[PDB]
Amino acid sequence: GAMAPSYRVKRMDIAKNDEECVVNAANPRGLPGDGVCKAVYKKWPESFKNSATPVGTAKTVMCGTYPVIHAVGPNFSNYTESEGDRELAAAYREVAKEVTRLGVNSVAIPLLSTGVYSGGKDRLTQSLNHLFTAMDSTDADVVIYCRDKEWEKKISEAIQMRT
Ligand SMILES: [Cl-]
Ligand SMILES: [Cl-]
Ligand SMILES: [Cl-]
């Protein structure tokens, strides 16, 4: 585990992370996709061998010795707000189990269901709070990746409020 487990946020491509493993914001079919998923496919294509997994779950596939944890958040265009909230919380709980099982000291994670699976709604707080609920009991250093300047400021504020 990390000596003093922390949360940090960086505004950059998660494919350039400086952590011991990465969480892909995957689709259930293991396809290259778009956004974070397409960047992950270009950087670690070998990790997409048998990576298909249902909504609400996470499946890890190794690229060399580097773990890629494919986590499938719900697409809010298809789920109700109630059922989607439950599956989004569940995907993050499965990421925490995988990070623990892998024994890594750090993990790079995106905010699941906040891009093309958001159903056109701002889900920063919803997704980040489910990330904290799952990851708080792990001892890995967590580094959250985002691309928008206003999102970086809001995520940073939410991390600092708890310290
Ligand atoms: Cl970048
Ligand atoms: Cl998304
Ligand atoms: Cl973003």
PDB file of all heavy atoms in Angstrom, residues 9 14 23-25 36 71 73 88 92 108-118 122-132 142-147 151-152 154-155:
ATOM      1  N   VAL A   9      -5.913  14.901  -8.534  1.00  0.00           N
ATOM      2  CA  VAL A   9      -6.570  15.014  -9.824  1.00  0.00           C
ATOM      3  C   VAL A   9      -5.606  15.656 -10.825  1.00  0.00           C
ATOM      4  O   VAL A   9      -4.862  16.585 -10.469  1.00  0.00           O
ATOM      5  CB  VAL A   9      -7.914  15.795  -9.769  1.00  0.00           C
ATOM      6  CG1 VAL A   9      -7.712  17.208  -9.188  1.00  0.00           C
ATOM      7  CG2 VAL A   9      -8.580  15.885 -11.134  1.00  0.00           C
ATOM      8  N   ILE A  14      -5.384  10.088 -19.745  1.00  0.00           N
ATOM      9  CA  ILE A  14      -5.103   8.948 -18.844  1.00  0.00           C
ATOM     10  C   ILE A  14      -4.148   7.922 -19.471  1.00  0.00           C
ATOM     11  O   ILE A  14      -3.488   7.175 -18.750  1.00  0.00           O
ATOM     12  CB  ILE A  14      -6.430   8.292 -18.366  1.00  0.00           C
ATOM     13  CG1 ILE A  14      -6.209   7.461 -17.096  1.00  0.00           C
ATOM     14  CG2 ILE A  14      -7.076   7.461 -19.485  1.00  0.00           C
ATOM     15  CD1 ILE A  14      -7.552   7.004 -16.493  1.00  0.00           C
ATOM     16  N   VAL A  23      -7.662   2.310 -14.975  1.00  0.00           N
ATOM     17  CA  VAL A  23      -9.068   1.882 -15.120  1.00  0.00           C
ATOM     18  C   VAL A  23      -9.562   2.455 -16.437  1.00  0.00           C
ATOM     19  O   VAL A  23      -9.468   3.666 -16.667  1.00  0.00           O
ATOM     20  CB  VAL A  23      -9.931   2.446 -13.958  1.00  0.00           C
ATOM     21  CG1 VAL A  23     -11.414   2.161 -14.199  1.00  0.00           C
ATOM     22  CG2 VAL A  23      -9.465   1.872 -12.623  1.00  0.00           C
ATOM     23  N   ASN A  24     -10.047   1.580 -17.323  1.00  0.00           N
ATOM     24  CA  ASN A  24     -10.650   2.005 -18.576  1.00  0.00           C
ATOM     25  C   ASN A  24     -12.173   2.233 -18.351  1.00  0.00           C
ATOM     26  O   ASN A  24     -12.842   1.423 -17.690  1.00  0.00           O
ATOM     27  CB  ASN A  24     -10.498   0.856 -19.611  1.00  0.00           C
ATOM     28  CG  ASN A  24     -11.063   1.256 -20.977  1.00  0.00           C
ATOM     29  OD1 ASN A  24     -11.152   2.458 -21.293  1.00  0.00           O
ATOM     30  ND2 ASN A  24     -11.402   0.239 -21.797  1.00  0.00           N
ATOM     31  N   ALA A  25     -12.716   3.299 -18.934  1.00  0.00           N
ATOM     32  CA  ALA A  25     -14.168   3.534 -18.910  1.00  0.00           C
ATOM     33  C   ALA A  25     -14.668   2.756 -20.157  1.00  0.00           C
ATOM     34  O   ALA A  25     -14.805   3.309 -21.265  1.00  0.00           O
ATOM     35  CB  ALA A  25     -14.437   5.030 -19.049  1.00  0.00           C
ATOM     36  N   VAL A  36     -12.122   8.171 -23.520  1.00  0.00           N
ATOM     37  CA  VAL A  36     -11.102   7.454 -22.720  1.00  0.00           C
ATOM     38  C   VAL A  36     -10.861   6.032 -23.302  1.00  0.00           C
ATOM     39  O   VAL A  36      -9.713   5.613 -23.467  1.00  0.00           O
ATOM     40  CB  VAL A  36     -11.489   7.363 -21.219  1.00  0.00           C
ATOM     41  CG1 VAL A  36     -10.664   6.294 -20.481  1.00  0.00           C
ATOM     42  CG2 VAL A  36     -11.307   8.712 -20.523  1.00  0.00           C
ATOM     43  N   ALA A  71     -13.758  -1.148 -16.564  1.00  0.00           N
ATOM     44  CA  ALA A  71     -14.926  -0.962 -15.684  1.00  0.00           C
ATOM     45  C   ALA A  71     -16.079  -0.424 -16.526  1.00  0.00           C
ATOM     46  O   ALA A  71     -15.908   0.602 -17.205  1.00  0.00           O
ATOM     47  CB  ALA A  71     -14.586   0.068 -14.596  1.00  0.00           C
ATOM     48  N   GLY A  73     -19.476   1.289 -16.714  1.00  0.00           N
ATOM     49  CA  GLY A  73     -20.546   2.081 -16.117  1.00  0.00           C
ATOM     50  C   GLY A  73     -21.773   2.018 -17.027  1.00  0.00           C
ATOM     51  O   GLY A  73     -21.681   1.661 -18.211  1.00  0.00           O
ATOM     52  N   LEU A  88     -23.764   2.267 -11.433  1.00  0.00           N
ATOM     53  CA  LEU A  88     -22.545   3.105 -11.425  1.00  0.00           C
ATOM     54  C   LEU A  88     -21.816   2.858 -10.082  1.00  0.00           C
ATOM     55  O   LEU A  88     -20.575   2.678 -10.058  1.00  0.00           O
ATOM     56  CB  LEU A  88     -22.972   4.583 -11.542  1.00  0.00           C
ATOM     57  CG  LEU A  88     -21.844   5.641 -11.486  1.00  0.00           C
ATOM     58  CD1 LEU A  88     -20.746   5.339 -12.526  1.00  0.00           C
ATOM     59  CD2 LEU A  88     -22.421   7.051 -11.704  1.00  0.00           C
ATOM     60  N   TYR A  92     -17.865   0.903  -9.551  1.00  0.00           N
ATOM     61  CA  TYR A  92     -16.740   1.379  -8.723  1.00  0.00           C
ATOM     62  C   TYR A  92     -16.380   0.386  -7.600  1.00  0.00           C
ATOM     63  O   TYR A  92     -15.180   0.214  -7.280  1.00  0.00           O
ATOM     64  CB  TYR A  92     -17.076   2.747  -8.133  1.00  0.00           C
ATOM     65  CG  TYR A  92     -16.866   3.907  -9.083  1.00  0.00           C
ATOM     66  CD1 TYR A  92     -17.936   4.690  -9.504  1.00  0.00           C
ATOM     67  CD2 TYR A  92     -15.596   4.245  -9.532  1.00  0.00           C
ATOM     68  CE1 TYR A  92     -17.738   5.824 -10.270  1.00  0.00           C
ATOM     69  CE2 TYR A  92     -15.390   5.367 -10.325  1.00  0.00           C
ATOM     70  CZ  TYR A  92     -16.467   6.162 -10.679  1.00  0.00           C
ATOM     71  OH  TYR A  92     -16.290   7.324 -11.401  1.00  0.00           O
ATOM     72  N   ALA A 108      -4.755   4.896 -11.772  1.00  0.00           N
ATOM     73  CA  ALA A 108      -5.242   6.057 -12.555  1.00  0.00           C
ATOM     74  C   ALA A 108      -6.713   5.740 -12.896  1.00  0.00           C
ATOM     75  O   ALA A 108      -6.990   4.657 -13.408  1.00  0.00           O
ATOM     76  CB  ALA A 108      -4.451   6.164 -13.851  1.00  0.00           C
ATOM     77  N   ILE A 109      -7.640   6.639 -12.558  1.00  0.00           N
ATOM     78  CA  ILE A 109      -9.057   6.371 -12.779  1.00  0.00           C
ATOM     79  C   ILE A 109      -9.788   7.550 -13.416  1.00  0.00           C
ATOM     80  O   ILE A 109      -9.596   8.696 -13.009  1.00  0.00           O
ATOM     81  CB  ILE A 109      -9.683   5.987 -11.402  1.00  0.00           C
ATOM     82  CG1 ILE A 109     -11.101   5.350 -11.508  1.00  0.00           C
ATOM     83  CG2 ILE A 109      -9.685   7.152 -10.439  1.00  0.00           C
ATOM     84  CD1 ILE A 109     -11.535   4.629 -10.228  1.00  0.00           C
ATOM     85  N   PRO A 110     -10.650   7.276 -14.392  1.00  0.00           N
ATOM     86  CA  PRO A 110     -11.501   8.342 -14.955  1.00  0.00           C
ATOM     87  C   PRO A 110     -12.879   8.368 -14.220  1.00  0.00           C
ATOM     88  O   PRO A 110     -13.223   7.410 -13.499  1.00  0.00           O
ATOM     89  CB  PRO A 110     -11.736   7.857 -16.399  1.00  0.00           C
ATOM     90  CG  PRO A 110     -11.842   6.331 -16.231  1.00  0.00           C
ATOM     91  CD  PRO A 110     -10.932   5.955 -15.024  1.00  0.00           C
ATOM     92  N   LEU A 111     -13.705   9.438 -14.422  1.00  0.00           N
ATOM     93  CA  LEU A 111     -15.045   9.449 -13.813  1.00  0.00           C
ATOM     94  C   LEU A 111     -16.002   8.689 -14.721  1.00  0.00           C
ATOM     95  O   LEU A 111     -16.378   9.180 -15.809  1.00  0.00           O
ATOM     96  CB  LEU A 111     -15.527  10.882 -13.557  1.00  0.00           C
ATOM     97  CG  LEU A 111     -14.714  11.663 -12.490  1.00  0.00           C
ATOM     98  CD1 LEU A 111     -15.370  13.030 -12.197  1.00  0.00           C
ATOM     99  CD2 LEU A 111     -14.597  10.893 -11.173  1.00  0.00           C
ATOM    100  N   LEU A 112     -16.405   7.478 -14.293  1.00  0.00           N
ATOM    101  CA  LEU A 112     -17.295   6.640 -15.120  1.00  0.00           C
ATOM    102  C   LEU A 112     -18.628   7.328 -15.352  1.00  0.00           C
ATOM    103  O   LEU A 112     -19.128   8.077 -14.492  1.00  0.00           O
ATOM    104  CB  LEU A 112     -17.539   5.303 -14.386  1.00  0.00           C
ATOM    105  CG  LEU A 112     -16.244   4.519 -14.075  1.00  0.00           C
ATOM    106  CD1 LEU A 112     -16.598   3.247 -13.260  1.00  0.00           C
ATOM    107  CD2 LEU A 112     -15.504   4.117 -15.375  1.00  0.00           C
ATOM    108  N   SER A 113     -19.215   7.043 -16.550  1.00  0.00           N
ATOM    109  CA  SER A 113     -20.548   7.525 -16.940  1.00  0.00           C
ATOM    110  C   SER A 113     -20.702   9.058 -16.986  1.00  0.00           C
ATOM    111  O   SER A 113     -21.845   9.558 -16.931  1.00  0.00           O
ATOM    112  CB  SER A 113     -21.632   6.899 -16.070  1.00  0.00           C
ATOM    113  OG  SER A 113     -21.652   5.481 -16.219  1.00  0.00           O
ATOM    114  N   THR A 114     -19.580   9.788 -17.169  1.00  0.00           N
ATOM    115  CA  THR A 114     -19.643  11.252 -17.261  1.00  0.00           C
ATOM    116  C   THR A 114     -19.506  11.836 -18.677  1.00  0.00           C
ATOM    117  O   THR A 114     -19.682  13.052 -18.844  1.00  0.00           O
ATOM    118  CB  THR A 114     -18.624  11.949 -16.332  1.00  0.00           C
ATOM    119  OG1 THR A 114     -17.279  11.630 -16.727  1.00  0.00           O
ATOM    120  CG2 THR A 114     -18.874  11.638 -14.871  1.00  0.00           C
ATOM    121  N   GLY A 115     -19.198  10.999 -19.653  1.00  0.00           N
ATOM    122  CA  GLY A 115     -19.039  11.452 -21.037  1.00  0.00           C
ATOM    123  C   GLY A 115     -20.247  11.054 -21.868  1.00  0.00           C
ATOM    124  O   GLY A 115     -21.380  11.397 -21.512  1.00  0.00           O
ATOM    125  N   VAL A 116     -20.020  10.251 -22.943  1.00  0.00           N
ATOM    126  CA  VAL A 116     -21.152   9.866 -23.804  1.00  0.00           C
ATOM    127  C   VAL A 116     -22.175   8.910 -23.123  1.00  0.00           C
ATOM    128  O   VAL A 116     -23.271   8.720 -23.654  1.00  0.00           O
ATOM    129  CB  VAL A 116     -20.649   9.288 -25.139  1.00  0.00           C
ATOM    130  CG1 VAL A 116     -19.741  10.285 -25.857  1.00  0.00           C
ATOM    131  CG2 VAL A 116     -19.895   7.996 -24.896  1.00  0.00           C
ATOM    132  N   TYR A 117     -21.863   8.361 -21.931  1.00  0.00           N
ATOM    133  CA  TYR A 117     -22.842   7.550 -21.192  1.00  0.00           C
ATOM    134  C   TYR A 117     -23.601   8.408 -20.155  1.00  0.00           C
ATOM    135  O   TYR A 117     -24.361   7.856 -19.364  1.00  0.00           O
ATOM    136  CB  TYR A 117     -22.125   6.410 -20.433  1.00  0.00           C
ATOM    137  CG  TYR A 117     -21.800   5.159 -21.238  1.00  0.00           C
ATOM    138  CD1 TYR A 117     -21.968   5.122 -22.618  1.00  0.00           C
ATOM    139  CD2 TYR A 117     -21.346   4.008 -20.608  1.00  0.00           C
ATOM    140  CE1 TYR A 117     -21.655   3.979 -23.348  1.00  0.00           C
ATOM    141  CE2 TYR A 117     -21.053   2.856 -21.319  1.00  0.00           C
ATOM    142  CZ  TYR A 117     -21.186   2.845 -22.693  1.00  0.00           C
ATOM    143  OH  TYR A 117     -20.857   1.703 -23.425  1.00  0.00           O
ATOM    144  N   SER A 118     -23.415   9.738 -20.131  1.00  0.00           N
ATOM    145  CA  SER A 118     -24.068  10.580 -19.114  1.00  0.00           C
ATOM    146  C   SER A 118     -25.549  10.871 -19.377  1.00  0.00           C
ATOM    147  O   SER A 118     -26.205  11.494 -18.542  1.00  0.00           O
ATOM    148  CB  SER A 118     -23.321  11.901 -18.958  1.00  0.00           C
ATOM    149  OG  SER A 118     -23.532  12.672 -20.133  1.00  0.00           O
ATOM    150  N   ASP A 122     -24.875  16.537 -16.275  1.00  0.00           N
ATOM    151  CA  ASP A 122     -23.618  16.733 -15.548  1.00  0.00           C
ATOM    152  C   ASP A 122     -23.644  15.769 -14.378  1.00  0.00           C
ATOM    153  O   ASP A 122     -24.465  15.916 -13.467  1.00  0.00           O
ATOM    154  CB  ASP A 122     -23.560  18.187 -15.030  1.00  0.00           C
ATOM    155  CG  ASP A 122     -22.410  18.539 -14.115  1.00  0.00           C
ATOM    156  OD1 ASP A 122     -21.731  17.609 -13.619  1.00  0.00           O
ATOM    157  OD2 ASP A 122     -22.191  19.758 -13.877  1.00  0.00           O
ATOM    158  N   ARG A 123     -22.745  14.757 -14.409  1.00  0.00           N
ATOM    159  CA  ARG A 123     -22.699  13.725 -13.364  1.00  0.00           C
ATOM    160  C   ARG A 123     -21.356  13.705 -12.612  1.00  0.00           C
ATOM    161  O   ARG A 123     -20.992  12.689 -11.997  1.00  0.00           O
ATOM    162  CB  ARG A 123     -22.951  12.342 -14.002  1.00  0.00           C
ATOM    163  CG  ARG A 123     -24.368  12.278 -14.613  1.00  0.00           C
ATOM    164  CD  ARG A 123     -24.734  10.879 -15.105  1.00  0.00           C
ATOM    165  NE  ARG A 123     -26.009  10.942 -15.844  1.00  0.00           N
ATOM    166  CZ  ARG A 123     -27.222  10.870 -15.305  1.00  0.00           C
ATOM    167  NH1 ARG A 123     -27.371  10.671 -13.998  1.00  0.00           N
ATOM    168  NH2 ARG A 123     -28.301  10.949 -16.072  1.00  0.00           N
ATOM    169  N   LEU A 124     -20.647  14.860 -12.577  1.00  0.00           N
ATOM    170  CA  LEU A 124     -19.362  14.922 -11.848  1.00  0.00           C
ATOM    171  C   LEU A 124     -19.524  14.496 -10.386  1.00  0.00           C
ATOM    172  O   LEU A 124     -18.838  13.577  -9.930  1.00  0.00           O
ATOM    173  CB  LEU A 124     -18.815  16.391 -11.911  1.00  0.00           C
ATOM    174  CG  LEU A 124     -17.357  16.628 -11.408  1.00  0.00           C
ATOM    175  CD1 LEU A 124     -16.896  18.029 -11.804  1.00  0.00           C
ATOM    176  CD2 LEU A 124     -17.224  16.496  -9.897  1.00  0.00           C
ATOM    177  N   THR A 125     -20.455  15.160  -9.645  1.00  0.00           N
ATOM    178  CA  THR A 125     -20.589  14.874  -8.215  1.00  0.00           C
ATOM    179  C   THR A 125     -21.080  13.471  -7.969  1.00  0.00           C
ATOM    180  O   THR A 125     -20.580  12.758  -7.088  1.00  0.00           O
ATOM    181  CB  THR A 125     -21.503  15.929  -7.580  1.00  0.00           C
ATOM    182  OG1 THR A 125     -20.812  17.205  -7.684  1.00  0.00           O
ATOM    183  CG2 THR A 125     -21.807  15.623  -6.093  1.00  0.00           C
ATOM    184  N   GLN A 126     -22.060  13.043  -8.767  1.00  0.00           N
ATOM    185  CA  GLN A 126     -22.607  11.675  -8.598  1.00  0.00           C
ATOM    186  C   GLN A 126     -21.513  10.605  -8.787  1.00  0.00           C
ATOM    187  O   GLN A 126     -21.381   9.669  -7.979  1.00  0.00           O
ATOM    188  CB  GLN A 126     -23.759  11.439  -9.603  1.00  0.00           C
ATOM    189  CG  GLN A 126     -24.263  10.024  -9.666  1.00  0.00           C
ATOM    190  CD  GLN A 126     -25.368   9.890 -10.693  1.00  0.00           C
ATOM    191  OE1 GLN A 126     -25.450  10.644 -11.681  1.00  0.00           O
ATOM    192  NE2 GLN A 126     -26.218   8.899 -10.460  1.00  0.00           N
ATOM    193  N   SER A 127     -20.765  10.724  -9.880  1.00  0.00           N
ATOM    194  CA  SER A 127     -19.762   9.720 -10.195  1.00  0.00           C
ATOM    195  C   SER A 127     -18.588   9.784  -9.202  1.00  0.00           C
ATOM    196  O   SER A 127     -18.111   8.727  -8.736  1.00  0.00           O
ATOM    197  CB  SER A 127     -19.292   9.907 -11.629  1.00  0.00           C
ATOM    198  OG  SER A 127     -18.406   8.866 -12.038  1.00  0.00           O
ATOM    199  N   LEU A 128     -18.136  11.023  -8.874  1.00  0.00           N
ATOM    200  CA  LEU A 128     -17.016  11.166  -7.930  1.00  0.00           C
ATOM    201  C   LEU A 128     -17.381  10.627  -6.555  1.00  0.00           C
ATOM    202  O   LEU A 128     -16.523  10.021  -5.896  1.00  0.00           O
ATOM    203  CB  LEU A 128     -16.577  12.638  -7.851  1.00  0.00           C
ATOM    204  CG  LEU A 128     -15.412  12.951  -6.899  1.00  0.00           C
ATOM    205  CD1 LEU A 128     -14.160  12.237  -7.341  1.00  0.00           C
ATOM    206  CD2 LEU A 128     -15.175  14.492  -6.860  1.00  0.00           C
ATOM    207  N   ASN A 129     -18.616  10.882  -6.075  1.00  0.00           N
ATOM    208  CA  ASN A 129     -19.000  10.371  -4.770  1.00  0.00           C
ATOM    209  C   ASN A 129     -19.050   8.843  -4.753  1.00  0.00           C
ATOM    210  O   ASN A 129     -18.659   8.243  -3.727  1.00  0.00           O
ATOM    211  CB  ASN A 129     -20.310  11.026  -4.302  1.00  0.00           C
ATOM    212  CG  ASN A 129     -20.060  12.432  -3.772  1.00  0.00           C
ATOM    213  OD1 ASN A 129     -18.930  12.795  -3.380  1.00  0.00           O
ATOM    214  ND2 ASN A 129     -21.114  13.214  -3.654  1.00  0.00           N
ATOM    215  N   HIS A 130     -19.460   8.202  -5.876  1.00  0.00           N
ATOM    216  CA  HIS A 130     -19.432   6.735  -5.891  1.00  0.00           C
ATOM    217  C   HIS A 130     -17.965   6.233  -5.921  1.00  0.00           C
ATOM    218  O   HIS A 130     -17.668   5.168  -5.361  1.00  0.00           O
ATOM    219  CB  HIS A 130     -20.219   6.205  -7.092  1.00  0.00           C
ATOM    220  CG  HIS A 130     -21.694   6.323  -6.918  1.00  0.00           C
ATOM    221  ND1 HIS A 130     -22.322   6.015  -5.710  1.00  0.00           N
ATOM    222  CD2 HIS A 130     -22.640   6.674  -7.823  1.00  0.00           C
ATOM    223  CE1 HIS A 130     -23.629   6.199  -5.922  1.00  0.00           C
ATOM    224  NE2 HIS A 130     -23.870   6.577  -7.173  1.00  0.00           N
ATOM    225  N   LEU A 131     -17.063   6.983  -6.574  1.00  0.00           N
ATOM    226  CA  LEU A 131     -15.645   6.628  -6.611  1.00  0.00           C
ATOM    227  C   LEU A 131     -15.099   6.666  -5.166  1.00  0.00           C
ATOM    228  O   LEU A 131     -14.473   5.700  -4.708  1.00  0.00           O
ATOM    229  CB  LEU A 131     -14.892   7.646  -7.518  1.00  0.00           C
ATOM    230  CG  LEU A 131     -13.405   7.367  -7.832  1.00  0.00           C
ATOM    231  CD1 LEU A 131     -13.010   8.203  -9.074  1.00  0.00           C
ATOM    232  CD2 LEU A 131     -12.494   7.768  -6.644  1.00  0.00           C
ATOM    233  N   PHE A 132     -15.394   7.766  -4.433  1.00  0.00           N
ATOM    234  CA  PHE A 132     -14.891   7.839  -3.045  1.00  0.00           C
ATOM    235  C   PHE A 132     -15.481   6.709  -2.193  1.00  0.00           C
ATOM    236  O   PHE A 132     -14.765   6.136  -1.358  1.00  0.00           O
ATOM    237  CB  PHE A 132     -15.309   9.194  -2.438  1.00  0.00           C
ATOM    238  CG  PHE A 132     -14.589  10.428  -2.941  1.00  0.00           C
ATOM    239  CD1 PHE A 132     -15.201  11.678  -2.888  1.00  0.00           C
ATOM    240  CD2 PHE A 132     -13.280  10.370  -3.358  1.00  0.00           C
ATOM    241  CE1 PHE A 132     -14.514  12.833  -3.281  1.00  0.00           C
ATOM    242  CE2 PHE A 132     -12.592  11.535  -3.748  1.00  0.00           C
ATOM    243  CZ  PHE A 132     -13.213  12.754  -3.711  1.00  0.00           C
ATOM    244  N   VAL A 142      -4.757   7.221  -5.364  1.00  0.00           N
ATOM    245  CA  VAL A 142      -5.694   7.297  -6.488  1.00  0.00           C
ATOM    246  C   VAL A 142      -5.455   8.608  -7.214  1.00  0.00           C
ATOM    247  O   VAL A 142      -5.391   9.676  -6.578  1.00  0.00           O
ATOM    248  CB  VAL A 142      -7.143   7.213  -5.956  1.00  0.00           C
ATOM    249  CG1 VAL A 142      -8.180   7.495  -7.075  1.00  0.00           C
ATOM    250  CG2 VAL A 142      -7.420   5.851  -5.302  1.00  0.00           C
ATOM    251  N   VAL A 143      -5.303   8.542  -8.537  1.00  0.00           N
ATOM    252  CA  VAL A 143      -5.127   9.764  -9.328  1.00  0.00           C
ATOM    253  C   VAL A 143      -6.264   9.790 -10.344  1.00  0.00           C
ATOM    254  O   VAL A 143      -6.363   8.895 -11.169  1.00  0.00           O
ATOM    255  CB  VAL A 143      -3.746   9.812 -10.020  1.00  0.00           C
ATOM    256  CG1 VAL A 143      -3.581  11.127 -10.793  1.00  0.00           C
ATOM    257  CG2 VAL A 143      -2.654   9.683  -8.964  1.00  0.00           C
ATOM    258  N   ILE A 144      -7.150  10.788 -10.220  1.00  0.00           N
ATOM    259  CA  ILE A 144      -8.306  10.921 -11.104  1.00  0.00           C
ATOM    260  C   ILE A 144      -7.925  11.754 -12.290  1.00  0.00           C
ATOM    261  O   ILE A 144      -7.321  12.819 -12.119  1.00  0.00           O
ATOM    262  CB  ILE A 144      -9.440  11.615 -10.288  1.00  0.00           C
ATOM    263  CG1 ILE A 144      -9.806  10.752  -9.050  1.00  0.00           C
ATOM    264  CG2 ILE A 144     -10.667  11.899 -11.171  1.00  0.00           C
ATOM    265  CD1 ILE A 144     -10.645  11.518  -7.984  1.00  0.00           C
ATOM    266  N   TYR A 145      -8.278  11.293 -13.495  1.00  0.00           N
ATOM    267  CA  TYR A 145      -7.944  12.030 -14.721  1.00  0.00           C
ATOM    268  C   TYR A 145      -9.187  12.638 -15.329  1.00  0.00           C
ATOM    269  O   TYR A 145     -10.219  11.979 -15.416  1.00  0.00           O
ATOM    270  CB  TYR A 145      -7.280  11.073 -15.728  1.00  0.00           C
ATOM    271  CG  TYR A 145      -5.838  10.802 -15.326  1.00  0.00           C
ATOM    272  CD1 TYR A 145      -5.532   9.926 -14.283  1.00  0.00           C
ATOM    273  CD2 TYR A 145      -4.788  11.428 -15.984  1.00  0.00           C
ATOM    274  CE1 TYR A 145      -4.217   9.706 -13.894  1.00  0.00           C
ATOM    275  CE2 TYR A 145      -3.469  11.228 -15.604  1.00  0.00           C
ATOM    276  CZ  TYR A 145      -3.178  10.366 -14.547  1.00  0.00           C
ATOM    277  OH  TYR A 145      -1.880  10.181 -14.139  1.00  0.00           O
ATOM    278  N   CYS A 146      -9.073  13.883 -15.797  1.00  0.00           N
ATOM    279  CA  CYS A 146     -10.196  14.559 -16.448  1.00  0.00           C
ATOM    280  C   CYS A 146      -9.635  15.407 -17.608  1.00  0.00           C
ATOM    281  O   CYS A 146      -8.403  15.459 -17.764  1.00  0.00           O
ATOM    282  CB  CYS A 146     -10.966  15.429 -15.445  1.00  0.00           C
ATOM    283  SG  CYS A 146     -10.022  16.866 -14.828  1.00  0.00           S
ATOM    284  N   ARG A 147     -10.511  15.988 -18.450  1.00  0.00           N
ATOM    285  CA  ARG A 147     -10.005  16.791 -19.571  1.00  0.00           C
ATOM    286  C   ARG A 147     -10.456  18.266 -19.512  1.00  0.00           C
ATOM    287  O   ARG A 147      -9.830  19.115 -20.162  1.00  0.00           O
ATOM    288  CB  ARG A 147     -10.376  16.177 -20.939  1.00  0.00           C
ATOM    289  CG  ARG A 147      -9.838  14.738 -21.142  1.00  0.00           C
ATOM    290  CD  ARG A 147      -8.316  14.620 -21.027  1.00  0.00           C
ATOM    291  NE  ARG A 147      -7.607  15.340 -22.090  1.00  0.00           N
ATOM    292  CZ  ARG A 147      -7.232  14.786 -23.244  1.00  0.00           C
ATOM    293  NH1 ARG A 147      -7.558  13.528 -23.524  1.00  0.00           N
ATOM    294  NH2 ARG A 147      -6.586  15.505 -24.152  1.00  0.00           N
ATOM    295  N   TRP A 151     -13.957  21.138 -14.620  1.00  0.00           N
ATOM    296  CA  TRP A 151     -14.062  19.870 -13.890  1.00  0.00           C
ATOM    297  C   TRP A 151     -12.850  19.648 -13.007  1.00  0.00           C
ATOM    298  O   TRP A 151     -12.982  19.185 -11.872  1.00  0.00           O
ATOM    299  CB  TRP A 151     -14.321  18.689 -14.835  1.00  0.00           C
ATOM    300  CG  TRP A 151     -15.764  18.614 -15.262  1.00  0.00           C
ATOM    301  CD1 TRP A 151     -16.595  19.658 -15.560  1.00  0.00           C
ATOM    302  CD2 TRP A 151     -16.564  17.433 -15.312  1.00  0.00           C
ATOM    303  NE1 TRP A 151     -17.866  19.190 -15.803  1.00  0.00           N
ATOM    304  CE2 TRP A 151     -17.869  17.823 -15.672  1.00  0.00           C
ATOM    305  CE3 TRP A 151     -16.311  16.082 -15.061  1.00  0.00           C
ATOM    306  CZ2 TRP A 151     -18.896  16.901 -15.856  1.00  0.00           C
ATOM    307  CZ3 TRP A 151     -17.341  15.174 -15.207  1.00  0.00           C
ATOM    308  CH2 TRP A 151     -18.618  15.587 -15.593  1.00  0.00           C
ATOM    309  N   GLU A 152     -11.642  19.993 -13.488  1.00  0.00           N
ATOM    310  CA  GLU A 152     -10.435  19.833 -12.681  1.00  0.00           C
ATOM    311  C   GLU A 152     -10.552  20.629 -11.361  1.00  0.00           C
ATOM    312  O   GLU A 152     -10.269  20.097 -10.292  1.00  0.00           O
ATOM    313  CB  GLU A 152      -9.184  20.287 -13.476  1.00  0.00           C
ATOM    314  CG  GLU A 152      -7.886  20.164 -12.698  1.00  0.00           C
ATOM    315  CD  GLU A 152      -6.683  20.833 -13.366  1.00  0.00           C
ATOM    316  OE1 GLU A 152      -6.875  21.602 -14.336  1.00  0.00           O
ATOM    317  OE2 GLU A 152      -5.549  20.583 -12.895  1.00  0.00           O
ATOM    318  N   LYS A 154     -13.369  21.676  -9.820  1.00  0.00           N
ATOM    319  CA  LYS A 154     -14.412  21.089  -8.967  1.00  0.00           C
ATOM    320  C   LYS A 154     -13.990  19.775  -8.310  1.00  0.00           C
ATOM    321  O   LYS A 154     -14.286  19.544  -7.134  1.00  0.00           O
ATOM    322  CB  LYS A 154     -15.721  20.924  -9.737  1.00  0.00           C
ATOM    323  CG  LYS A 154     -16.413  22.292  -9.922  1.00  0.00           C
ATOM    324  CD  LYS A 154     -17.717  22.176 -10.697  1.00  0.00           C
ATOM    325  CE  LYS A 154     -17.520  22.131 -12.197  1.00  0.00           C
ATOM    326  NZ  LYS A 154     -18.809  22.404 -12.913  1.00  0.00           N
ATOM    327  N   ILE A 155     -13.272  18.923  -9.052  1.00  0.00           N
ATOM    328  CA  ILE A 155     -12.788  17.665  -8.463  1.00  0.00           C
ATOM    329  C   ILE A 155     -11.746  17.973  -7.382  1.00  0.00           C
ATOM    330  O   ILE A 155     -11.774  17.399  -6.283  1.00  0.00           O
ATOM    331  CB  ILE A 155     -12.195  16.726  -9.548  1.00  0.00           C
ATOM    332  CG1 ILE A 155     -13.290  16.327 -10.543  1.00  0.00           C
ATOM    333  CG2 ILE A 155     -11.572  15.476  -8.904  1.00  0.00           C
ATOM    334  CD1 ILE A 155     -12.706  15.718 -11.893  1.00  0.00           C
TER     335      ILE A 155
END
